[PDB]
């Protein structure tokens, strides 16, 4: 099948920048090649398409380049409305594929996440369930790692995660991930480890907590 | 001034079938080459192009869902339907149908409908539990609300009657594999304020008529 991969999958830049990001398919496609901006809650909007043209209505910001296989989008001097996720589009062969979009996000230091993790309450114990979460606040980029240990034993695939949008004014972001157990587990173990990876780390950090204790 | 909108259950059971119209006006589905297609987003995922359908009648699918959809047209009541067979919790996303010009401007979807969100999920409406997330010159401690096992969404989270509003991160739900929701909502305090200060969290699930005011503390 045609892949349209774009490039980079995640920007982060600032008001008044020009960036420029590209979407390349692996088959040539001639000049049916559309790019979209989506602003988080709403449908795609066209910005180009014809690979080069404007869409009528469109801010002269953007611009569009590119035949065959390769293809760009620029926007010249990036506005506050313009930090979302861009799309491209092939319409030369069916099925008409999407790119897998690249996310645009405001450009601050960077800053590692407060760690804090939560032990399940004994309310919910009750249940035959245990939920035990882990909090990374207001950290920047947005590529954070999360490992969960019980008793020096790494979980995998009984976690979820989700993040918050970009803090408007702190223009940091915050996550949440929880790690179930039975109840029998969780009773089975006593150390429980999150541990956090982050480019705002040296290193990174655990938390921690033992059952009993 | 086209216009497109999707129309259809917005819940659906993980073996049922799953139907969406799309109606449309500013322009007719009877013209040269005019194409009206469908487009989805898993809210944690890009745009996935499902089908589309032309003045002719034409139609073409996505190949790897091509023996579940179905796509039909209206022309006496400017509507397109998308039928969806064999559906599971991986099909929930927000479903688009948009329009494509006719023979240029052919090269893309220019006018897209609000799209219609659609959850797959064999569970019966459910309030939410709402359990704690306890805290412990240095100062900013974390705490918080699990507000676990309800639907479907949403649900509104605020502390102390909206009083506190600075340091609240409530955060998007997650589907488990339950088919109910889990959401968690946070607040960073200073430590000083654990002893004197009070932290409880509204939880609203309209759905359900469930209220639940959660006091959280050490």
């Known amino acids: 099948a045609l892949q349209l991969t774009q490039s980079p999958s995640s920007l982060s830049a600032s008001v008044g920048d020009r960036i420029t990001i590209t979407c390349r398919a692996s088959?040539?496609?001639?000049?049916?090649l559309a790019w979209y901006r989506q602003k988080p809650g709403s449908p795609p909007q066209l910005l180009i398409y014809?690979?080069?043209s404007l869409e009528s209505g469109v801010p002269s910001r953007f611009s569009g380049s590119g035949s065959g296989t390769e293809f760009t989008l620029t926007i010249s001097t990036l506005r506050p409305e313009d930090f979302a996720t861009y799309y491209c589009?092939?319409?030369?062969?069916?099925?008409?594929?999407f790119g897998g979009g690249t996310r645009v996000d405001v450009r601050r230091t960077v800053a590692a996440p407060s760690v804090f993790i939560f032990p399940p309450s004994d309310e919910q114990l009750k249940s035959g369930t245990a939920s035990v979460v882990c909090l990374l606040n207001n950290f920047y980029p947005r590529e954070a790692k999360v490992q969960w240990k019980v008793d020096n034993a790494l979980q995998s695939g009984n976690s979820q995660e989700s993040v918050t949008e970009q803090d408007s004014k702190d223009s940091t972001y915050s996550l949440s991930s929880t790690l179930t157990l039975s109840k029998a587990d969780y009773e089975k173990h006593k150390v429980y480890e999150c541990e956090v990876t982050h480019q705002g780390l040296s290193s990174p950090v655990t938390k921690s907590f033992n059952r009993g204790e | 001034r086209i216009t497109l909108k999707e129309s259809g259950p917005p819940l659906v059971k993980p073996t049922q079938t799953l139907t969406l119209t799309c109606s449309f006006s500013?322009?007719?589905?009877?013209?040269?080459?005019?194409?009206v297609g469908w487009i989805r987003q898993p809210p944690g995922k890009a745009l996935e192009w499902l089908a589309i359908?032309?003045?002719?009648?034409?139609?073409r699918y996505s190949p790897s869902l091509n023996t579940r959809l179905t796509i039909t047209k209206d022309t006496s009541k400017n509507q397109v339907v998308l039928v969806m067979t064999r559906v599971s919790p991986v099909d929930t996303a927000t479903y688009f149908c948009?329009?494509?010009?006719?023979?240029?401007?052919?090269?893309?979807?220019?006018?897209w409908g609000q799209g219609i969100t659609v959850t797959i999920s064999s569970t019966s409406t459910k309030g939410p539990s709402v359990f704690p997330l306890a805290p412990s010159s240095g100062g900013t401690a974390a705490l918080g609300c699990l507000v676990k096992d309800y639907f479907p969404e949403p649900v509104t989270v605020s502390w102390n009657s909206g009083a506190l509003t600075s340091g609240v991160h409530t955060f998007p739900a997650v589907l488990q594999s339950s088919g109910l929701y889990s959401l968690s909502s946070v607040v960073t305090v200073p430590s000083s304020s654990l002893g004197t200060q009070t932290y409880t969290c509204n939880v609203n699930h309209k759905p359900s008529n469930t209220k639940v005011d959660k006091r959280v503390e050490p």
């Open positions: 948009a329009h494509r010009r006719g023979p240029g401007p052919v090269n893309a979807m220019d006018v």
């Open positions: 500013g322009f007719s589905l009877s013209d040269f080459g005019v194409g």
């Open positions: 359908i032309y003045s002719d009648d034409d139609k």
């Open positions: 088959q040539g496609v001639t000049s049916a």
């Open positions: 014809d690979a080069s």
């Open positions: 589009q092939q319409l030369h062969f069916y099925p008409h594929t």
